[PDB]
Amino acid sequence: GAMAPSYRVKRMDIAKNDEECVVNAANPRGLPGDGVCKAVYKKWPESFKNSATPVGTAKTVMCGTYPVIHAVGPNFSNYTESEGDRELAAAYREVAKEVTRLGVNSVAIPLLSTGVYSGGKDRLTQSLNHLFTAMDSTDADVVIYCRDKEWEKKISEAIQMRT
Ligand SMILES: Nc1ccc2ncccc2c1
Ligand SMILES: Nc1ccc2ncccc2c1
Ligand SMILES: [Cl-]
Ligand SMILES: [Cl-]
Structure with missing residues (x-):
């Protein structure tokens, strides 16, 4: 720990992280995809061997000795708000299990x-709170990666508010 x-x-x-493992925002089919997933595919392509896994789960594949935890969040275009929220919380619980293992x-x-996968909605608070619910009981240093300067500010404030 x-x-x-x-x-x-x-x-x-996130492809330039300084941590001991990475979580991919994966698709269920193990495809190269776009956004985070495409950056992860370009950096750790070996990690996409048999990475396909259902929504709400995480599957780890090693690139050399570097673990890539493929975590499949729901696409809110396809899920109801209620079912999507359940699968999003579940994906993060599976990440906590893998990080611990x-x-x-x-x-x-x-x-x-x-x-x-946001279904065109701002889900910063929703997704971050599910991340905290899952990761609070783990003893790993967690480093959240984002792109937007105003998201960085909001995520930083949410972390600081608990300290
Ligand atoms: N957390 C993020 C968000 C967007 C990204 N886009 C490309 C590569 C890495 C990225 C990480
Ligand atoms: N500041 C950032 C954040 C995420 C990125 N993802 C890919 C490429 C450049 C990026 C810059
Ligand atoms: Cl996404
Ligand atoms: Cl962002």
């Missing part, structure tokens, strides 16, 4: 279902 487990946020490409001291994580 980390000596003093923390949450941090960085505004940069791997025995890593740190993990890089994107906010699941906030991009092309």
Whole structure:
């Protein structure tokens, strides 16, 4: 575990993380996809061997000795708000199990279902709160990666509010 487990946020490409493992915002089919998933495919393509997994689950594939945790958030275009919310919480619980099993001291994580799976809605608070529910009982240092400068500010404030 980390000596003093923390949450941090960085505004940069998760493919350039400084953590001991990465969470992919995967699609269920293990396809290269777009956004975070495409960046992860370009950096760790070997990790996409038999990575296909259902919505609400996480599957880890090693790139050399570097673990890539493929986490499949719901596409809110297809799911009801109620069912999507359940699957989004579940995906994060499976990430917490995998991070614990791997025995890593740190993990890089994107906010699941906030991009092309958002169904055109702002889900920063929804997705972050499910991330905290899952990861609060783990002792890994968590580093959240985002792109938008105003999202960085909002994520940073939400972390600081609990400290
Ligand atoms: N500041 C950022 C955040 C995310 C990115 N993703 C890919 C490429 C450049 C990026 C820059
Ligand atoms: N957390 C994020 C958000 C968007 C990105 N786009 C490309 C590559 C990495 C990225 C990480
Ligand atoms: Cl997404
Ligand atoms: Cl963002």
